[PDB]
Structure formats: C-alpha cells, structure tokens
C-alpha cells in the first residue's frame, strides 16, 4: 500500500473499457479515471497509447498555466516486473 505496488500483467490486461483507465509508462500503471473526465478526449489520451515506441512526446497539449507534469498523482503502482522484462529461468546453471 501507500508505495507502489507490484500489479499482474492479467489485471492491467481485463480493464478494457468500464469506466477508468489503466495507462502504462515503463513499469508504474496509471489509474487515470480522473483525467478521463478532466480531460475530455475520448479513452486513450496519455500519450496516444496504442501504437508508439519510444516516450519522447510524454504530454501534448490542455493545461498552459499547467507546466508541471500530471503523471504523479494519478497512479496506483507498478506492473509485476516478471511479465514485464522476462523471467526466463534458464535450466539450472550459469
């Protein structure tokens, strides 16, 4: 709790639609449900999210007076780093 947690790759992976937001950056999940609605779009805004590579346009555009980044506040942890890198245990030696 309170720090980031370690989420599943099989729960970030079932919210689909419902009504929040489960944006990923490299490894925190973001529960952007709030920005869903302050930030009328449509469902995939954060940094486009669906087709990109590198995180070099992290923002684009609503906020002016809003310099500071709102990727903080509206996270909940981060992804189980198993799934996310590659846990391929080899057979049983170096």
């Given at each position: 709790?309170?720090?980031?947690?370690?989420?599943?790759?099989?729960?970030?992976?079932?919210?689909?639609?419902?009504?929040?937001?489960?944006?990923?950056?490299?490894?925190?999940?973001?529960?952007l449900?709030?920005?869903?609605?302050?930030?009328?779009?449509?469902?995939?805004?954060?940094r486009?999210?669906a087709?990109?590579?590198?995180?070099?346009?992290?923002?684009?555009?609503?906020?002016?007076?809003?310099?500071?980044?709102?990727?903080?506040?509206?996270?909940?942890?981060?992804?189980?780093?198993?799934?996310?890198?590659?846990?391929?245990?080899?057979?049983?030696?170096?």
């Open positions: 709790d309170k720090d980031v947690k370690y989420y599943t790759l099989e729960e970030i992976q079932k919210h689909k639609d419902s009504k929040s937001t489960w944006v990923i950056l490299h490894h925190k999940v973001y529960d449900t709030k920005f869903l609605e302050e930030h009328p779009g449509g469902e995939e805004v954060l486009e999210q087709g990109g590579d590198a995180t070099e346009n992290f923002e684009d555009v609503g906020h002016s007076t809003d310099a500071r980044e709102l990727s903080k506040t509206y996270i909940i942890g981060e992804l189980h780093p198993d799934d996310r890198s590659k846990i391929a245990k080899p057979s049983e030696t170096l």
